[PDB]
Design a protein around this ligand. Structure first.
Ligand SMILES: CN(Cc1cnc2nc(N)nc(N)c2n1)c1ccc(C(=O)N[C@@H](CCC(=O)O)C(=O)O)cc1
Ligand SMILES: *[C@@H]1O[C@H](CO)[C@@H](O[C@@H]2O[C@H](CO)[C@@H](O)[C@H](O)[C@H]2NC(C)=O)[C@H](O)[C@H]1NC(C)=O
Ligand SMILES: *[C@@H]1O[C@H](CO)[C@@H](O[C@@H]2O[C@H](CO)[C@@H](O)[C@H](O)[C@H]2NC(C)=O)[C@H](O)[C@H]1NC(C)=O
Ligand SMILES: [Cl-]
Ligand SMILES: [Cl-]
Ligand SMILES: [K+]
Length: 205
């Protein structure tokens, strides 16, 4: 149980162990007291088609700012959170040894993300597997047309759950309940996800 608290998963850019990073950039700054990401990672992850995975958000024309801020935020959580131990699973992949499964995302964060992305476009309902990477950057593969976000993600759950192969599930608990993981939080009273990781480590046991 306690073994699941305050760890970093074994993945491409993660630090070995959580620790302070006073210089976390922009949207990742709320993790600055305790983070699995380096300052340099936090900086690079804000960029379009960044060097972290050469991943292009603007694969079906430009993704709108109100939408892209959520993908940036989600990447801060993925690369920086020391509070997702309870959901870590082993995986066979060339670029990471572990990933997350069924992280209980607060329903409002999923809802807000889905809504803010309605005016954006994509060509796939799962962005973890199946891209054409032959150019060095992800491109829509054979059979995959550009459509409205809603076409590929007809509900908030389809976005948050389908996007990274069920790395999230949409919790029925709300932001602030201490019973779901917040993607978006300010740090004034601490990182609220610590208490959540603590609760589920024991509750899932
Ligand atoms: C967006 N990005 C970084 C990345 C990867 N996994 C995540 N997982 C979660 N839960 N959240 C993220 N933000 C996240 N981000 C990506 C996306 C695709 C590939 C990729 O190489 N996909 C190959 C699959 C490679 C493989 O066989 O493992 C493909 O088929 O398209 C790498 C990094
Ligand atoms: C990663 O790969 C290994 C090896 O293929 C998987 O383990 C095997 O699983 C099968 C059943 O699916 C067993 O019969 C074999 O004995 C296992 N082989 C070894 C070498 O352990 C493993 O399950 C994979 N991990 C995931 C999450 O799929
Ligand atoms: C998720 O949470 C909502 C809100 O807390 C739950 O809502 C209510 O459910 C009961 C009985 O099903 C109703 O009588 C109430 O009027 C509902 N409130 C609202 C505002 O809808 C909901 O049941 C929960 N979902 C699950 C699957 O447990
Ligand atoms: Cl590389
Ligand atoms: Cl706003
Ligand atoms: K966190």
């Amino acid at each position: 149980r306690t073994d699941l608290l305050n760890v970093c998963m074994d993945a491409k850019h993660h630090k070995t162990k959580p620790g302070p990073e006073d210089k976390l950039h922009d949207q990742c700054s709320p993790w600055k007291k305790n983070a699995c990401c380096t300052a340099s990672t936090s900086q690079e992850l804000h960029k379009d088609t960044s060097r972290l995975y050469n991943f292009n958000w603007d694969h079906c024309g430009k993704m709108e700012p109100a939408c892209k801020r959520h993908f940036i935020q989600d990447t801060c959580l993925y690369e920086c959170s020391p509070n997702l131990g309870p959901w870590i699973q082993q995986v066979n992949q060339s670029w990471r040894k572990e990933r997350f499964l069924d992280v209980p995302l607060c329903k409002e964060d999923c809802q807000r993300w889905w809504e803010d992305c309605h005016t954006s476009h994509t060509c796939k309902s799962n962005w973890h597997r199946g891209w054409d990477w032959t150019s060095g950057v992800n491109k829509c593969p054979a059979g995959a047309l550009c459509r409205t976000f809603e076409s590929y993600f007809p509900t908030p759950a389809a976005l948050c759950e389908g996007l990274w192969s069920h790395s999230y599930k949409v919790s029925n608990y709300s932001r602030g309940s201490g019973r779901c993981i917040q993607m978006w939080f300010d740090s004034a009273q601490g990182n609220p996800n610590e208490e959540v990781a603590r609760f589920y480590a024991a509750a899932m046991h």
